[PDB]
Every structure is written in C-alpha cells, then in structure tokens.
Amino acid sequence: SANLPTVLVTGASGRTGQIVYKKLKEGSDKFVAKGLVRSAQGKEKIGGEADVFIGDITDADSINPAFQGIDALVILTSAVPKMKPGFDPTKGGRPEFIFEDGQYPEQVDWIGQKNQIDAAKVAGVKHIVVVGSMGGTNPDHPLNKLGNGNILVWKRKAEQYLADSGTPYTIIRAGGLLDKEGGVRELLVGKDDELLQTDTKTVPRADVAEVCIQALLFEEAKNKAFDLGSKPEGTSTPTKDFKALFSQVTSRF
Ligand SMILES: NC(=O)c1ccc[n+]([C@@H]2O[C@H](COP(=O)([O-])OP(=O)(O)OC[C@H]3O[C@@H](n4cnc5c(N)ncnc54)[C@H](OP(=O)(O)O)[C@@H]3O)[C@@H](O)[C@H]2O)c1
Numbered sequence: 249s250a251n252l253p254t255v256l257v258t259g260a261s262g263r264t265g266q267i268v269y270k271k272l273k274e275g276s277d278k279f280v281a282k283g284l285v286r287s288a289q290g291k292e293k294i295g296g297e298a299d300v301f302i303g304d305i306t307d308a309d310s311i312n313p314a315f316q317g318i319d320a321l322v323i324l325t326s327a328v329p330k331m332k333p334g335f336d337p338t339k340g341g342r343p344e345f346i347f348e349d350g351q352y353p354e355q356v357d358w359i360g361q362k363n364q365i366d367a368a369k370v371a372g373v374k375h376i377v378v379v380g381s382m383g384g385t386n387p388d389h390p391l392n393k394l395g396n397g398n399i400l401v402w403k404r405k406a407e408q409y410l411a412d413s414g415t416p417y418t419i420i421r422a423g424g425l426l427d428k429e430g431g432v433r434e435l436l437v438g439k440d441d442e443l444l445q446t447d448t449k450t451v452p453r454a455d456v457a458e459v460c461i462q463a464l465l466f467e468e469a470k471n472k473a474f475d476l477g478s479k480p481e482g483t484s485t486p487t488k489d490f491k492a493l494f495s496q497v498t499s500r501f
Pocket residue numbers: 259260261262263264265285286287290303304305306324325326327328356360379380381382421422423424425426453
C-alpha cells in the first residue's frame with residue numbers, strides 16, 4: 249500500500265455526488281474512484297464504468313460489495329421529498345411534500361448512513377467524509393417539517409454517530425446548494441450555523457464536491473465538523489490553500 253487510496257462515493261448519481269465521482273476519476277494521480285448508486289439508471293448517468301456499483305443503503309446486504317477494499321468513503325446520499333400529488337394552487341394552500349414509505353430521513357439519512365459507516369468500518373476504511381446541511385443547531389428549523397421527516401435531526405444523528413465512531417471523519421454542513429460554477433468563489437467555513445446570520449450562506453454543488461476531495465488530502469480535515477458557504481462569483485478570490493482553510497476548523501462536532 250504505496251498504492252493510491254480507493255475512494256468510494258455514495259449517492260454517486262445525485263447532483264453533488266456525480267461531481268465528486270467525476271473529480272475522483274480525473275484525480276487518477278491521487279485516488280482510485282469507486283461509486284455507489286441506487287439504480288442501473290443512475291449507473292448509466294455517470295458513465296456505466298465497472299467501478300460503479302448499484303445498491304440501496306436501506307438494505308445493507310446490497311451495498312456490501314461496493315464497500316469491499318475501500319480506503320475512504322464520501323457519503324453523499326440523502327432522503328428526497330417529492331411534491332404530494334394533490335396540489336391545487338388556486339385556492340390558497342401550500343404544497344405538501346412526502347417521502348415514500350421506507351424512504352424517510354430516519355431510514356435513509358440516519359439508518360442508511362449508519363449502514364454505510366458500519367460497513368466502511370468493517371472494511372477498514374481510513375477516513376469517512378459526509379455531506380449534510382446547515383440548520384442543525386435548531387430543531388425547530390422549517391426543513392424538519394418537510395414531509396414530517398425531521399430531515400436535519402436525523403442527519404445530525406448520523407453526523408454524531410460518525411463523530412463518535414472512532415474512524416477519522418469530516419462533516420461538511422453545506423449551505424443552500426447552487427447549480428453554478430465551481431472553483432470560482434472564496435469559500436467560507438463556519439461553526440454552528442453562524443453563516444446563516446450572513447449573506448454568504450449558499451454554495452455551488454461543484455465547490456461542495458471539491459471540498460470533499462481536498463478533505464481527503466489534508467490531515468487537517470480529519471476529525472472536523474464545519475459549515476460551508478461561499479461569497480458570490482466575480483466578488484473576491486477563489487479558494488486555493490485548503491491546508492489553511494481546514495486549519496481554520498477546530499470543532500469536532
Ligand atoms: N438541496 C440543498 O440546497 C441542500 C442544502 C444543504 C445540504 N444539502 C444536502 O447536500 C447533500 C447533496 O445534495 P444534492 O442535492 O446534491 O443530493 P441529491 O441530488 O438529492 O442526491 C441524493 C442521492 O441520494 C441517493 N439515494 C436516496 N436514497 C438512497 C438509497 N436508498 N440508497 C442509495 N442511494 C440513495 C439518490 O439516488 P437517486 O439518484 O436514485 O435518486 C441521490 O443520488 C444532501 O445530503 C442534501 O441533503 C442539500
């Protein structure tokens with residue numbers, strides 16, 4: 249094992265996950281990519297290569313092969329609520345959202361992530377990175393009501409479990425995600441939702457992807473939990489010194 253580390257990214261066909269997968273592939277001088285997706289559909293979306301496996305994190309037997317012989321894991325899975333199909337705007341309600349049964353945050357963001365961290369640990373992973381969301385400091389956050397899922401709460405439960413696990417970890421609580429260009433913004437690190445009080449509380453999905461990659465390359469990123477926002481493009485100088493960036497972070501949770 250002068251060999252480069254094998255990095256498995258889960259949720260690899262999701263919007264952020266697909267970018268991590270791409271960056272892991274391009275980074276063939278530093279990493280060996282692997283990916284886990286929920287469907288043959290998702291597999292083809294990211295290129296159908298043989299380093300992509302299909303499995304469901306709520307059924308732990310199915311994800312086992314993906315987890316074999318990995319040195320690092322980037323968890324990019326999430327419960328995803330859908331619009332309840334009954335909606336009729338023209339007498340003032342607001343849309344209700346739901347999660348399919350067995351697809352609620354408790355099952356996917358807590359249990360699902362527990363499944364992944366547990367199998368990673370069985371496999372002897374060296375570093376687990378997880379992406380979640382800002383808001384977690386406030387259990388009354390409106391997002392928790394989405395589909396009655398308590399999504400932030402269950403996610404933070406998995407983050408806590410990860411932090412308590414004994415495996416070196418990086419927890420990245422993203423601000424509101426943007427479908428905009430990465431690598432073109434100064435990136436900001438925060439603690440305990442402080443950025444929610446600022447105007448720099450959103451972040452390109454590409455920059456979240458890049459922070460995940462850099463986490464893998466600096467000891468400084470290990471046993472760290474932090475929030476991730478950004479300043480807008482064209483305003484200031486895009487982050488390049490990640491050692492500095494991660495040395496700003498002291499929080500373990
Ligand atoms: N949206 C925001 O503004 C916001 C803000 C802050 C943080 N975040 C968090 O940021 C992270 C990335 O967000 P994103 O929008 O880029 O993610 P995303 O597009 O929703 O991708 C989530 C992935 O999870 C996968 N997944 C769901 N259930 C699964 C299961 N049972 N087994 C295996 N995979 C499963 C989905 O697979 P499929 O492709 O098959 O559906 C999907 O690829 C998420 O944790 C999200 O909660 C989001």
